[PDB]
Design a protein around this ligand. Sequence first.
Ligand SMILES: Nc1ncnc2c1ncn2[C@@H]1O[C@H](CSCC[C@H](N)C(=O)O)[C@@H](O)[C@H]1O
Ligand SMILES: Nc1ncnc2c1ncn2[C@@H]1O[C@H](CSCC[C@H](N)C(=O)O)[C@@H](O)[C@H]1O
Lengths: 662, 651
Amino acid sequence: NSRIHIGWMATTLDVAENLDRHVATFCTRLGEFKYNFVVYPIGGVVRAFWTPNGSAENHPPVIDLPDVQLRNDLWESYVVGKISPWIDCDSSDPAFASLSEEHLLKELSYICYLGLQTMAIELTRISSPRTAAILKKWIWTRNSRFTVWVQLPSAIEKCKDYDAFTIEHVDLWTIWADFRKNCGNFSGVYFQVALTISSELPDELTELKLVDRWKAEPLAAFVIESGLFISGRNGEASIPSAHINLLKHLWTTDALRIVLRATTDTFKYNTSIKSEYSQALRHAVRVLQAPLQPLSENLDSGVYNTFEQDQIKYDVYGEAVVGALKDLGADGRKTVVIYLLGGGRGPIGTKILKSEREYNNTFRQGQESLKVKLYIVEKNPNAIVTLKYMNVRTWKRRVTIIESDMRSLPGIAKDRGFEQPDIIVSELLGSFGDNELSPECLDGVTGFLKPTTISIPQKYTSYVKPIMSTHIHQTIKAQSIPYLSRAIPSHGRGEPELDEDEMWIQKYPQGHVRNNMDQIYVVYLSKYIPLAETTKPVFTFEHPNFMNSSNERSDSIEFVMDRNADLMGFAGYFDLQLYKTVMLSIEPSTHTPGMVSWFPAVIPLRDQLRVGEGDRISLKIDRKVDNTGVWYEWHVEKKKTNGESVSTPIQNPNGESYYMRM
Amino acid sequence: AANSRIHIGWMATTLDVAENLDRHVATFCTRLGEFKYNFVVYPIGGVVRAFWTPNGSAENHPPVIDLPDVQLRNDLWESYVVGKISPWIDCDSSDPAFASLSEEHLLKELSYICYLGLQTMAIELTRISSPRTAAILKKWIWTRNSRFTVWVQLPSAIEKCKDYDAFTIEHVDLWTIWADFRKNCGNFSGVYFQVALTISSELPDELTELKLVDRWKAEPLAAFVIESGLFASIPSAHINLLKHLWTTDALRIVLRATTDTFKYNTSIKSEYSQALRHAVLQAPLQPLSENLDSGVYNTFEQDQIKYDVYGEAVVGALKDLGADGRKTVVIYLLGGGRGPIGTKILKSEREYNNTFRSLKVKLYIVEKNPNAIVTLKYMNVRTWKRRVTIIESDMRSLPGIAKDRGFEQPDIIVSELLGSFGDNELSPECLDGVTGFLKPTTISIPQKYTSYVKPIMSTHIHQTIKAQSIPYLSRAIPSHGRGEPELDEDEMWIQKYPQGHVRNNMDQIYVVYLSKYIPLAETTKPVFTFEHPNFMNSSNERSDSIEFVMDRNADLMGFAGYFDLQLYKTVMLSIEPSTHTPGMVSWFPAVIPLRDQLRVGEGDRISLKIDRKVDNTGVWYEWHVEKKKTNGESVSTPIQNPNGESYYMRM
Ligand SMILES: Nc1ncnc2c1ncn2[C@@H]1O[C@H](CSCC[C@H](N)C(=O)O)[C@@H](O)[C@H]1O
Ligand SMILES: Nc1ncnc2c1ncn2[C@@H]1O[C@H](CSCC[C@H](N)C(=O)O)[C@@H](O)[C@H]1O
């Protein structure tokens, strides 16, 4: 069994009750039937198998395949996401085509969210130009690297655009080659074709001269239809000599997975011949990181889950909350309004509830309980998909799930009849504190709170410290972009484009190295050395910013060198008081023990600046703000004992190399 | 920690300069090993060259590089021996002539570390400032495709530097030295470009003053140099330093024979170590343009059957010519390499004389590769019994240097200057070079060759070729075309591709083991022929138009390339699909790729147009395709590699 992997393709013929909710027991039992992975519709079965043929008001079901119902590594191993069948960007009806584009995008974004390893997309035309374009740009601009199975039709004739009177020189291969070209010939290691086999085997799949083609193609899968018999024995579920010769012919590597497709409404041996098919099949072939940007990119579930593995952050948050409910609760209140701002998968939600309960059992002993109404505000739609499932299962529909960018609540609040909060709770922190746009995010929410409203975090502050490491510097400098990565979006103001070959490219006018040097980074400081014994304060922020103090900043941060050495840049840190006494910090001196939540930031210098015992170092750093985003410009000013003073060039002018947007 | 965990090396020294040593490193290192230490530092020139001392005028010069490779199989070399530059070299000598000399020999030495195919190598800094040395080094490592570790060995202390002057040495120290040199080679990845400390008997300030000592934790610290200036025992501060800076067990440590004229108890050798421990595409090769490293020869010499067949054509020519009645024949082996074809000629005379007969054979083995000559001298001595005259020359100027050194006209000239596409290594031009002094009777082995081309389909090969990428450390590797590295605005080496990266990828020939693909035809066709001796000096420039018909819906990505060559009359060898010599691995197929995959179907007519052009300084291919449907329509792809801009085989 081991060496051969065989997937089961979810079909309209195993749509049971709440299957989207119970994918666990699904792949479980299916697994019992001796097949490992599955091709499940990533939109959810209520969405995949929907039918558009209705009034102009028949809208498509929202994505509803919650991730929490299964640990992410399992999603990654077993499940393989197929795009909803009703999608057709190349519909003959312009409006449905547009609709199709939009929704294809949604499903792609979700495939990313669940963090799936492999994904199927089934062509239904002889030509899919629009689909090709959408997919092309997608894959070529994603920082991710998932695999893509392009399932083909059984034969030319099943195609929607098939005209038996104009197929001059077409076959299944021409289809695949045309699609593959149309997405820009991405790597076979990643862009792969899946053949669909059935009762009828076309000539091109038997006439040797043609079947040989698929050996020179990035073939990754055969999708086998249950169109077949029970010849011999106890009714042996078996396969034609031509079929066999085919699955044996092209079965080169044991990587190639085999999906089975249930065409026949045979509930089968009452669900116990699946394994018979499976058997039949098997026996016939045998360190730098960019800072996160939650505001402008949607965090996948991996990022979130990892976040969760740092339970200490959440514990501290809970303590902060109980403290708040204590300073407010001592007043003898009954009910209190809280807003979690950017809930993610909602660990701080469950934790906040946990806090209302603990607070009640310790403080309200033998007296009226203080109850909390909880609004969770969030923008990532996939995340929302998780927040609703959570709300249902664990939270008992108590919490109000508001999908929006919080910086917009001030409008939809009084309208949809939401009352002002007493506490707003957010966790939008970069390693450099405000490098993840927190101040602008939370500042967006001020127009709708009471002067009473206590905000957590209350305060946070960005620190810094000169370091020396030829390794970190030499590593930042030498980052290069391989062909497959040529169109991944820059962290700067510019975005990918089409070149003279109608191919996506991300140009870097300032130059590649430069572009490397004018960015912040988050690193696990390996082979470095401190040049200062202690760090210094850079940038503070306090919420709620009731007075609308400008979010932009400017500063000089000066140190003093005690030895001959090469200064390669600074390590940036941060600490934050959630509420009063309760706080957590990433700073070397005041570091929360055991906390892996944040690695230090690094503000690199273009060139390793040399220094010696005596010189005063003035790190100029400005945090400039823009209609469309925020960025750090920075540089160094060395001054020797004799007053003589030099300075390095201003790195990141206008955020051209590193520009956090909104 | 455990014994095998902590690695210890033995630096050579005048303290152990035995006789004939440069001809016997195997046993040397074997004894070394018996004394419980794995690797060994050793001068690449060989001791005789290594410890030479300039004193006379231009009358006396440095000993030639004479550390032969053959004395030990290449993997052994690659494992144990760490090469080290002769201490007498000083690219930064105060004397201009000596610095020039130093640059030349520093180069020869580097070239040799490449030749032997060593993994690691060490160079000793003897100045507070070594700018010229750093430039030669810089250009070397940036333009070398050869990835390989390097140790910058530091002096005992700032004081013993050649340019030491207690009057200007304001704020300078061993680390300042290292940071200057590291900065002057461009801050090459410390994964390769590293620094070794030499721990003297007197421990400096910066290596005990903790705050200072910590400097080396932020540096590519590679190895510790340990002088015998100790008692075997080791001082408190020494212990604390060696412990302190020793982070990765990956660090290495070498023994430096300084004070002890020898070890009283031989065992005092073994003691020290102990006491310390107690702490896929490829370009077509181009032998005329680039000197081959020794492992290329070492694997080149696994192709038993090439030598076998060469020897077969040799016995054949000794039959045909020897049958005359004479008792002697002269033969020029043109490009001996490491010489197995020479030993094959001598083995073929030796083996001819008893089945067909005397007929003594005089051998002239010519060779350009200055590093191979070491191997052909050691080879001429160890096996050949000095019966063969080695000639280190461009075989293309041999006709001229024929009288000055008393050379005799050749009856036969044996050579192997072909590649996986036959003529792709530029054999015709050099043999045409040797042409001008050949007797009219001279048979050229081989006599002829012809190239072959075969339409193929493989998305994998095509994508692979197109996606070729240059990372930062490889930014200065020279092009395969007319272009060469140049200094950028930061005085940093870069190889510019003004035609574009992708174009540069697609306008080149490759050699690949055909992995995932399909042939779009069932038989190859004739491309470019050539015939030696080219007695009339015909133009090596060629221009043909091969033809192929297509029989199915396919994506044509280019042609696979092959060759055949006749050595003499009947016997011969060929890499071609059907006629392919069995058992060979001598030549994987060429790939002449098209820029974008060409779509084809049943009945398409494909004309491959190839012009083999030649230049004053090199040669190149200019190829493309014409497609013509059954209807007679005729598209045509763009001329690839025009003027060898992407591909130009220099001479
Ligand atoms: N402007 C904004 N409006 C709404 N949500 C935002 C936002 N900016 C960031 N977020 C959300 O805030 C989250 C930051 S990561 C924090 C997730 C969760 N609080 C945890 O600690 O595990 C992301 O999930 C992102 O979707
Ligand atoms: N113009 C030239 N003059 C002298 N030698 C040349 C030359 N052009 C090429 N060569 C030599 O010819 C050899 C071709 S490869 C053959 C190597 C060797 N005969 C073997 O089979 O192992 C190279 O080693 C190169 O050094």
